[PDB]
Amino acid sequence: LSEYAVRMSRLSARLFGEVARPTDSKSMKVVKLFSEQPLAKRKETYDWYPNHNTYFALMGTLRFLGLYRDEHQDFRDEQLRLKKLRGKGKPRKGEGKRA
């Protein structure tokens, strides 16, 4: 090692646009901190779930508008029909417990 080596390295450093003045290994993290995309910002993170409200509401609309057809919702519906026709329904809010 030499002073010629230190000055050569500083030359390369300030030239290439890398870290110029000697720093700790610890502080260097902050370098890498702005050198990247932060974790919570990445599209592979915040865009993880497709919007469920979108598909759900869209297809339900398209259904009542008579375009899409949901056999699951028809099963459900028909079964709550035969559940309430029996007399066991879903109580109007506030009524069930105390009465």
């Binding site: 002073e3 010629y4 030359l11 030239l15």
Partner: protein, 110 residues
């Protein structure tokens, strides 16, 4: 295939320049070796610049050729500390001012 065309790996620009095709001086050429370092392959004389840091590839191209021009312009500038050069820093063994020289002169003295 898919809705989006944006590819992260696109941006990377490489430059490969043979140092034999450059107008460099002895001093300029070897100060450049010591300056650039790892980007230099010593057997085939190929210099490689990988540029990333900018979003658009035009920018990685202009900054890579920028690095080229910059290293060439500062390879010819001799400064104060280059006269401070350690003999251990040498890529060569110069017969001048050597230890083998003083061993020879002492052996011939005796």
């Amino acid at each position: 295939a898919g809705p989006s065309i944006r590819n992260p790996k696109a941006r990377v620009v490489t430059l490969r320049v043979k140092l034999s095709s450059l107008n460099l001086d002895d001093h300029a050429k070897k100060k450049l070796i010591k300056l650039v370092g790892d980007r230099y392959c010593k057997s085939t004389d190929v210099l490689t610049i990988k540029t990333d840091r900018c979003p658009l590839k035009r920018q990685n191209y202009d900054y890579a050729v920028y690095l080229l021009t910059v290293l060439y312009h500062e390879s010819w500038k001799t400064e104060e500390w280059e006269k401070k050069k350690t003999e251990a820093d040498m890529e060569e063994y110069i017969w001048e001012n050597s230890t083998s020289e003083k061993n020879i002169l002492e052996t011939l003295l005796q």
